[PDB]
Design a protein around this ligand. Structure first.
Ligand SMILES: CCCCCCCCCCCCCCCC(=O)O
Lengths: 11, 261
């Protein structure tokens, strides 16, 4: 749930 | 098939970065011409036209400039994440290893790619619509005058290699797919993926630059140089954080810098 992981998960 | 890996990485680079070296050279050669920022008057003019929302209310000019620096980095991290997701094999890595590779690779890739918008006199900013002079950045009060000059120094020697976008795309992929980053879960798998990309880079350079028999080891050294450049940059950013209370650090960049070096 980190900000970088949220970028990676963005569709 | 190795040609296919190179082509797929080049295509992913052209799709995902707003600036590439051809686009930058068209602008720097002289619709939408770049506004030149060479002093405080022209900084303030540029701000009102290109980042109007930032100054619609102001904090020292150096702090506003550093804010724009960070905003550029945040945008480039997004571009690098999308690029990474299109690197063949990257999406098959453990999600947490993907995060780790981005964490440790984005600023090395940022400063490598920054070279494409730099010449000896200045650099393109704001999606190609501003050109800020190297002397003006040197003129800023300490510590802010210390941010960009080492990046210009790196870029002048990097640009003398006369790489094109097909080279740089593979170079940036190799930066991201580094098996020796701290905290990786599947080192062996990442080392093998990296080996594949580095293999394609070596062959591509042999074909695209038949005049320079050392170009591949030159670029291996540039990767090492970029690691040192980033460590030093992180140290300066920490000085800014503790001594420049008005210079708010963006939370994504804070996350990248945390527990890095
Ligand atoms: C409107 C003029 C603004 C121009 C300000 C300069 C933008 C330069 C972009 C280079 C970013 C260098 C990165 C330093 C900040 C960071 O640590 O992410």
């Amino acid at each position: 749930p980190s900000l970088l992981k949220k970028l990676l998960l963005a569709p | 098939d190795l040609k296919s890996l190179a082509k797929r990485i080049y295509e992913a680079y052209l799709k995902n970065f707003n600036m590439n070296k051809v686009k930058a050279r068209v602008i720097l050669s002289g619709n939408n011409p770049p506004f030149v920022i060479h002093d405080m008057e022209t900084l303030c003019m540029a701000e009102k036209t290109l980042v109007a929302k930032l100054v619609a209310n102001n904090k020292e000019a150096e702090v506003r400039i550093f804010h724009c620096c960070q905003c550029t980095s945040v945008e480039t991290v997004t571009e690098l994440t999308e690029f990474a997701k299109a690197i063949p094999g990257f999406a098959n890595l453990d999600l947490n290893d993907q995060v780790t590779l981005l964490k440790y690779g984005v600023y090395e890739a940022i400063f490598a790619m920054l070279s494409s918008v730099m010449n000896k006199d200045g650099m393109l900013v704001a999606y190609g619509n501003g050109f800020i002079t190297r002397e003006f950045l040197k003129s800023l009060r300490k510590p802010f005058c210390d941010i960009m000059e080492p990046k210009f120094d790196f870029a002048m020697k990097f640009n003398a290699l006369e790489l094109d976008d097909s080279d740089i795309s593979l170079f940036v992929a190799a930066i991201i797919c580094c098996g020796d980053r701290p905290g990786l879960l599947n080192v062996g798998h990442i080392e093998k993926m990296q080996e594949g990309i580095v293999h394609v880079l070596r062959l591509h350079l042999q074909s695209n630059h038949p005049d320079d028999i050392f170009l591949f080891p030159k670029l291996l050294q540039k990767m090492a140089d970029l690691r040192q450049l980033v460590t030093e940059h992180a140290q300066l950013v920490q000085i800014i954080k503790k001594t420049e209370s008005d210079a708010a650090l963006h939370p994504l960049l804070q996350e990248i810098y945390r527990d890095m070096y």
